[PDB]
Design a protein around this ligand. Structure first.
Ligand SMILES: NC(=O)[C@@H]1CN2CCN(CC3CC3)C[C@@H]2[C@H]1c1ccccc1
Length: 284
């Protein structure tokens, strides 16, 4: 059913809460035994948000391979994403270890360091060119190369260096800075503009490792970003773009990480972004 019609029918009937609860009831339940080991309590931001064992990203070390991060692999769309929590003070070194080991080109950040008067993630990148960061526990160096500040987002060029090898790599940091402290944006126009800038960079393309995407828990805003991207790619590949079922795509993605899309308002905003993003290509 053409989702724009499905959309007005849910709005007119005000059943967003009922649709969202149906998704919560049908979603996959897989074990997360590694996340719950006592040695990993200070590696998890939230007790109720854990990566499944089958899809978790493993750090390349023998000591402790755990990070709160999942591989979302979308077979028909031919896209992969890593969804992770905002880094903690004791996991900033893990975060960069992962980016290096997985050969990612891009990091996508959908939160501010402080929101609602509380810290939502560590300051994990350098703010000045001449003050680089060294991650003692992971043997890596990170330098700010340039910064482009726009009204809705900031793009940064970073240099990541393997100290022991002396290998360097350019990482692009895409920072969406205007998601409101409460609720969802009124219009999806600036979020869709941002998604199109990440695409144009090459960060989402198969010649690189998967993009690393985070917010505070790595399920809500992060979920909205991957769901919108995959739905729009499926609309450009299929003979009938009205066949794309956003509820079925979200349940496929929930096989790989729990809790993607945290509220009925995030679900409505995801439908809105896909409907509008289609018009801008399938029309404009
Ligand atoms: N966290 C880790 O153990 C990994 C494995 N490797 C060997 C041990 N070395 C710790 C000694 C001080 C050099 C740290 C690094 C690190 C890493 C390497 C290359 C790129 C990104 C990260």
């Amino acid at each position: 059913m053409e989702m724009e019609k499905e959309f007005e029918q849910i709005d007119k009937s005000g059943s967003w809460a009922a649709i969202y609860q149906d998704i919560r009831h049908e979603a996959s339940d897989f074990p997360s035994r590694v996340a719950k080991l006592p040695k990993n309590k200070n590696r998890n931001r939230y007790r109720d948000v854990s990566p499944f064992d089958h899809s978790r990203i493993k750090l390349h070390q023998e000591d402790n391979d755990y990070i709160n991060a999942s591989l979302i692999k979308m077979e028909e769309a031919q896209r992969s994403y890593i969804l992770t929590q905002g880094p903690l003070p004791n996991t900033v070194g893990h975060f960069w270890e992962m980016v290096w080991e997985q050969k990612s080109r891009g990091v996508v950040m959908l939160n501010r360091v402080m929101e609602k008067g509380s810290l939502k993630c560590a300051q994990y990148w350098p703010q000045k060119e001449e003050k680089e960061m060294i991650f003692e526990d992971t043997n890596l160096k990170l330098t700010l190369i340039s910064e482009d500040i726009k009204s809705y987002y900031t793009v940064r060029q970073l240099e990541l260096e393997n100290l022991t090898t002396q290998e360097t790599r350019e990482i692009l940091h895409f920072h969406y800075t205007t998601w409101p402290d409460f609720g969802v944006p009124e219009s999806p126009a600036s979020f869709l503009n941002f998604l199109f800038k990440v695409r144009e960079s090459g960060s989402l393309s198969p010649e690189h490792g998967p993009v690393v995407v985070h917010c505070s828990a790595g399920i809500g805003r992060s979920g909205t970003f991957c769901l919108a991207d995959t739905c729009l790619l499926l609309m450009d590949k299929r003979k009938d773009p009205s066949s794309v079922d956003i509820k079925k795509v979200l349940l496929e993605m929930r096989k790989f990480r729990m809790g993607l899309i945290q509220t009925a308002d995030q679900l409505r905003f995801s439908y809105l972004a896909v409907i509008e993003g289609a018009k801008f290509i399938m029309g404009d």
